From a paper:
Abscisic acid (ABA) is a phytohormone essential to the regulation of numerous aspects of plant growth and development. ABCG25 in Arabidopsis thaliana has been identified to be an ABA exporter and play roles in regulating stomatal closure and seed germination. As a ‘half-transporter’ with only one NBD and one transmembrane domain (TMD) in a polypeptide chain, ABCG25 forms a homodimer as a functional unit, similar to other determined ‘half-transporter’ ABCG structures including the human cholesterol transporter ABCG1 (hABCG1) and multidrug transporter ABCG2 (hABCG2)39–47. In this study, we determined the high-resolution structures of ABCG25 in Arabidopsis thaliana in the apo, ABA-bound and ATP-bound states using cryogenic electron microscopy (cryo-EM) single particle analysis.
We also tried to remove CHS during protein purification and extracted the protein from the membrane using DDM alone. The removal of CHS led to dramatically decreased protein yield, indicating a critical role of CHS in stabilizing the protein. Nonetheless, with the purified protein, we obtained an EM map with an overall resolution of 3.7 Å. The protein structure remained almost unchanged compared to that determined with DDM plus CHS extraction, with an RMSD of 0.33 Å. However, in this map, we could still observe the two identical densities in the cavity, further supporting the idea that they are not contributed by CHS. We speculated that they may be some endogenous sterols in Sf9 cells.
Numbering used by the authors:
A (entry chain A), B (entry chain B): 33 to 48, 82 to 325, 337 to 359, 377 to 602, 626 to 662
Write the structure that this text describes.
Amino acid sequence: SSCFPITLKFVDVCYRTILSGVTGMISPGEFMAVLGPSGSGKSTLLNAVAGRLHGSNLTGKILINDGKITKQTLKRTGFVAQDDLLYPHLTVRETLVFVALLRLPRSLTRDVKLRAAESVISELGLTKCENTVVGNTFIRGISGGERKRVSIAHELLINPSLLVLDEPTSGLDATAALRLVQTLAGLAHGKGKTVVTSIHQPSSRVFQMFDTVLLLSEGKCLFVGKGRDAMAYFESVGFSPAFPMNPADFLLDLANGVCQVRQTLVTAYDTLLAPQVKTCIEVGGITTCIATWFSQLCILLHRLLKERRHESFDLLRIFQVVAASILCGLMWWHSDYRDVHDRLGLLFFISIFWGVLPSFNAVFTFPQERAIFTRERASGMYTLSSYFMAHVLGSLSMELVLPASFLTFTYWMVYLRPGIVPFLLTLSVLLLYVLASQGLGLALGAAIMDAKKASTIVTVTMLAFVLTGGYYVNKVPSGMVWMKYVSTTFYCYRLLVAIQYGSGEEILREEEVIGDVGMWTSVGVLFLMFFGYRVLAYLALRRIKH
Amino acid sequence: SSCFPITLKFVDVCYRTILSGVTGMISPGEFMAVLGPSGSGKSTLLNAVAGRLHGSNLTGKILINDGKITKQTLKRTGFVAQDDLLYPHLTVRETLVFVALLRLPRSLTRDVKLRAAESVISELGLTKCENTVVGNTFIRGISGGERKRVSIAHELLINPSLLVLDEPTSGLDATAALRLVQTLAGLAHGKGKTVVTSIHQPSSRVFQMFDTVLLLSEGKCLFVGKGRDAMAYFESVGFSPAFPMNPADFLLDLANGVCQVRQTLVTAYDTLLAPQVKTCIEVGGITTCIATWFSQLCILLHRLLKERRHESFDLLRIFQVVAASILCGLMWWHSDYRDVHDRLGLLFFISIFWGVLPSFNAVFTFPQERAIFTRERASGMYTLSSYFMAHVLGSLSMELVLPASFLTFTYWMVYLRPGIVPFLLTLSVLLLYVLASQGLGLALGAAIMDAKKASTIVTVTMLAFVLTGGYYVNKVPSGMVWMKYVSTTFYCYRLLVAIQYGSGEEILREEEVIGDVGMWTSVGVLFLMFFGYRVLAYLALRRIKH
């Protein structure tokens, strides 16, 4: 792999000071480690050499193969970050299949996009756990050193020629962190890539696997050399250990003061190594762009299918609906339609329960997956308008199966109106109201992007929708009668009474409670709240500038 | 300190195998490290040598100063565990003052119990942050290496002569984990104590601070010696490194296979070191016991005072009560008492809101602090009956200030009955109902001890209390009329109507809604649910056998 070499030179990097004159070169086929104490800015060097600091404070010359950070050579570079962002309910094989269908170019087949995702599984040693779910801290999945190899496989699908990693071995074991360094040395030696990593606290034989070492001590680097003459260099200045110790622990003490002194390391670097490195340092149309959109939406629906039915079918949401079905069928068992005060309280309990329950569970959707979206939209996998519509279409399928089972169990126990026409009109109003209540939660969760702070604002909003719905207060004090024309509970409840009683005179053989609004101007407003709360959630997610 | 030495011998420990013949002795004034791979059972050795495995599977001779694990010599032993259990809202000084008032003996003054808690602060180096709050991951407190010194200070108040620690330096920094080992070597050398610790992955100069080393490789130990002749012993068998490396990394490779082989280490141990260690291995009344109880309750009230007002006065619970006060004063503004259907809906909204809101927030109390309670009750600081009554008395003070401010703002806006006698009877019924609704949440949170699983059972229970309360369903189908005699919402709502309308005939100048239950048999049942739900929470916490 990678028969197209690369050479990375970063003459005089200065970031504002964090970095103050870092200079070195990275030949193709080298495995380099950036060593430094926690604060020297060894994470800032990796981002500003992979093209993540966009020339604002970065005053240096990051030139890639005697060039620049032009986008033609930036698609040959992968940056593996420090935290892992994976979906739990996908297995290891189908994690890397949906990523290969989104990242690899559109002018290929589906044949060599599945053989490009199984040549990456059986190269990082993931062929044992490929049918095991990924999981998280709450789902029994895969181990944390084998969870890191899925993040590295996510970057090797596009076949990069420069791989930049940010603390791979961190939290891993003693022997899991050695086999990971042994494959990263197998990429740089066997394939011919160029790996630049930053190891925090290496070990006695992890330091033997390295090839070149960079030592940062708050800005100015102290040593750039081939990783086994590091201990023979500092004894020429006059620094040497006493007791037998790790060669990586002797260097990380010279980086912060403790010797066996910090200022003479900086002066001796600019007189013997910096003259040595800097002499060598110069020598489709319209039909294409629509079918690309619908394929981004069909992959993102199947990728998120297992996540949506984890939200809407756990056993603590089924138990709240089975309980409310039994308590309604036992309180209003074989109810009579001639006592109007009881049946109007049945029809208002349905409006409270199915407006509070869809709106509350919808404010957790977008703040839960924000780091996953902003990492993957910035990497060119998908846009916002196809990510968003895969949540709109995928949530109006799973959220319409518990209210449809509530009503079937309950409709002929409590003796509502008999017939197939009053039953299918009562189900249609109930499912339109669940979709209008859900979009109010999606609009408040996206505008605020905090799940605990928006959970109390949907409480206060839905408390005012119930009180102005038309059941508790029979006469409203004349500066509050405007308030019922914005609530979803008012328009649902006037439609349920119009189906069960009609115009009103059929029971007259209690008139302000069977009053007049209109049956076509109540379904017309529940569609304006269906479409209108989904548009205000798109515009609230458009504001997040990456 | 510790002018009463101790000598720990643990001849032939075998635990069922985890441990299979561990044998050694620990002289007074030594700092010993137990080294081993993750799985060798170096945590099981520390618990079974501090007296935490109670002779069931532990088939060995744990003898302490040629004795046994009799309770007279077990109060001279401190075991610092691995995770830290601290209250966040207490500062560092008053954390160690409440612990000193509970652990030190009762036959002292309060003078030398505060000078015994400030000679521990200015000995572990906590005199800089003594006025800084402890915090957690969510509150900005103190650093995680300085959070560990508060756990060690918790065990040095009783002045032990054997201190046993379980991975102290874990998650700490490179230089924070060196200064912690330097004070633990200052206890064993300067004072004269006996420190036995188990370090996971030590460093190059952390290994120089040790004095004796124990090396466990799955059961049978491989080396017991004075920590600087460890590398000179294995080269006499014929094992030696090649590249320069940490002496703790060479040993932890011989413990699992990897050499520069595992079975010849076990045989060579039982022929040269085991004959060497085993030749030396033999040569008040009634007024006292009540005032002790009331002092445990006065300390535990002030210790938990800052935690109770974090629960009941955050800005997301104040915003739900200010919103409901405004929505009630605007919907029923200057209401009239002659339209009875509106005022009965005002009095039923108060019963729903103040039964759902106290019961929901009470199921989080006991599962939140279970590891703190079971650690500290087992250590002899307090019992269950004084820990429990400090939550009962401390929660009926802070939970009666938001419903008392709700009613004062609202009572003369919505024009309920004028006078000081109908106002103080309406406040008294509302505060008795809040205390009865709270105990139902405490009983369900303690029986289940899971905050998410009990949060849906208080939902289903309080949904059935509302529907059988007496407002929605006017006639109940004759097998469900028993169900209203167990709900708290029924007994509160019949008392509010009896204060605002009375016997009923005063408005008769709508009779099943101003019916008959009794005003003394409704306050008598709200007290039986006050006391009865608190007794069922004590019996549900009594079942947890440590």
